[PDB]
Assembly symmetry: C3
Homo-oligomer: 261 residues x 3
DNA sequence: CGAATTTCTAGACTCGAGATCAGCAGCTGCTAGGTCGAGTCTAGAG
DNA sequence: CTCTAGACTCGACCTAGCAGATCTCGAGTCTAGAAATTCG
């Protein structure tokens, strides 16, 4: 039997907002120790993983692990209506093909009741292999969002250069080219200002800007975003949702020969 | 000869903002007791009644009771150019020639003025009957607006029942079914953020959500709003215009088709 | 080599988004006195002249005076990426046809470097016959912007007949007519609201308000319009660039003989 | 600092013009119109 | 009186569509979402 009580409904609001456009349908896996979400893009290049644990949840109970197939557009539409301060009372009736959602109120005089129809999908599991990443960078989410948004205007692809003098983003296009660079900040002890960089070997890659723009939408979830990559491996973008879990992104680097044509 | 000083022109601004998207023509019955307006919708489904009291205006005088037909869409278009805190002394000539507007400024430093023509139209008078209603509910207007706007995401008809503990706002859209119940609380000392119902006999009806969304456009007029309905009786929505008067909204319930057969 | 270091990049941003919708290519003149710009419009109706005195720059140097051709729409887009409080370092080097732009964070933590390509153009000298003016007014920019925007609703031709007691911004249209009148007041302690007018000869003309809508975009630069007007002379409105200089705007009044057919 | 307000922007919708297409008739000769190059008139200087 | 250079005229010369249905496309309009602003 599945029940779930959450205090900060804004967390679910932000999660569904971030996941709304990149993915439309997903297999909502549920465990007895937490919630796991892993699906894939229609264009089949980007991979998303979610790790909503159970301890952070106010009330968690799952007798048997299930797997719900649910339209993410419907979840976003429903969840946006509820306010950003209510109480989430997620509950799934066993084999009922329906997920029950209940919204309370801080003053406890108005409650919400919504029912929506599950959609049966094909469960596809892809065990992600782990490996070291040469360049590891953590830096404030807002600056990253602004950087990606600005570089969107100029061109279409970005050349990350994890140079030891500070990361130097670079773009190009028929309207000229630009390159924004930062510096390793050590004096400021504030985490919301850290530009901490981990260096193993200089690297250089390339990624489509539109997918990075899509990825940056999860900014309200947290202030700090971590980057990691290495030679010819998919990009790692990490978001930390307080303590109930972490949200990750995976983007496959472009090929240099794609610039030739 | 007609004159009417309106110190709070914003009230009439919002009034025309509300009525604009429903009925495009109206014959304005003017009397020494005040200004009257009654017009029935284009689709012949809903009726709109408006009442203005003479004593509310700072200055108001009507030698002979008047009636003019005038477009409201252009009226609203020119009103949208007015400031939110202007002073209006709406005046019209004794001869049925045109319409005069006396736009002003709070600092008495600049004055605007517009001229509009009038078109004679049929004075189609329909006898409104006066009957009591089994169920009458008062409830904060913002909550009603939010409820209707949210339910618009689901379907086109909402089942409503004046329940023992409150109301039964619910709709069954193709995507799913959602229920919203309002706890009938009267222990609240301040009546503005409170709900109250007279319960006479159980009722159950349904309406059109698009028409409700159009109905709720007048939300900033007042904090409260009164609903009234009975068996096969058209639904009554009343908006209190501060001390100017009341705005009344009419909608017959959706006829229950013999879809069961 | 040409260098320009404007501390208040907001100024350049504002002038650029003001001119973006009127000129697609304009020659740029530099001088030890300062930068100059004069460019007649695309539709061959209005003229735009801009003064950029070098004394206003925190740092300026120009060995020899060149004439560069620069697009503007691309400049508007590229400068949109600039922040609101950054230090522009506009620089063109030697005979290279590339324009260098450098943005620095106020906290000097995010160093943005850009690049623009210029193209050669015809440098056409166009004489401006200076003369005296009959209807010359000084009046707050926001009021003029609001008036023109509101009158855009009424129609497409205004007729100012500058009044002995103020102005006569009257206009008409198929819907009707509207004559906003502003009383001339000089009993203002501060100069931010004065509407002082010099009146010597009667005057009245006609102009197109689409050009006026393009015309008023420069509102954020200052707050004191210095509109001047005289017998059958092209219309002139000037905005003061804080203390650096001025931006003059030129449009010939529409000939009423062309309204015969 | 949070929320309401206002403003802006971008995407969906509609309309008018331009292009394309599947089929026909059985014809290409005529009409409008634009260009262009050469003949020729005329004014000023020798 | 005659030679010569520029503008006007005339003749020559060329050339594009031939008929309806069907998309297609580009420009204009509206609205909803976003973002900036401001005030208590």
């Amino acid at each position: 039997m599945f029940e779930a009580r959450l205090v900060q409904g804004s967390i679910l609001k932000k999660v569904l907002e971030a996941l709304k456009d990149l993915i439309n349908e997903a297999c909502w896996d549920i465990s007895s120790s937490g919630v796991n979400l892993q699906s894939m893009d229609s264009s089949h290049v980007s991979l998303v993983q979610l790790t909503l644990r159970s301890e952070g949840f106010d009330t968690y109970r799952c007798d048997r692990n299930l797997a719900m197939g649910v339209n993410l557009t419907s979840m976003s539409k429903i969840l946006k209506c509820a306010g950003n301060e209510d109480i989430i009372t997620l509950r799934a009736e066993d084999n009922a093909d329906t997920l029950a959602l209940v919204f309370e109120a801080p003053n406890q005089e108005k409650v919400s009741d919504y029912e929506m129809k599950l959609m049966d999908l094909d469960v596809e599991q892809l065990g992600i292999p782990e490996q070291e990443y040469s360049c590891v960078v953590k830096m404030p989410s807002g600056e990253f969002a602004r950087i990606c948004r600005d570089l969107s205007h100029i061109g279409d692809a970005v050349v990350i250069s994890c140079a030891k003098d500070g990361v130097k983003f670079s773009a190009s296009g028929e309207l000229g080219n630009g390159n924004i660079k930062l510096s390793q900040t050590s004096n400021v002890d504030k985490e919301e200002e850290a530009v901490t960089i981990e260096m193993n070997e200089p690297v250089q890659l390339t990624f489509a800007l539109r997918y990075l723009n899509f990825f940056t939408k999860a900014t309200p979830l947290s202030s700090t975003v971590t980057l990691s990559m290495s030679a010819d491996v998919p990009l790692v973008v990490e978001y930390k949702i307080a303590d109930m879990g972490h949200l990750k992104y995976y983007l496959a680097p472009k090929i240099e020969d794609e610039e030739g044509s």
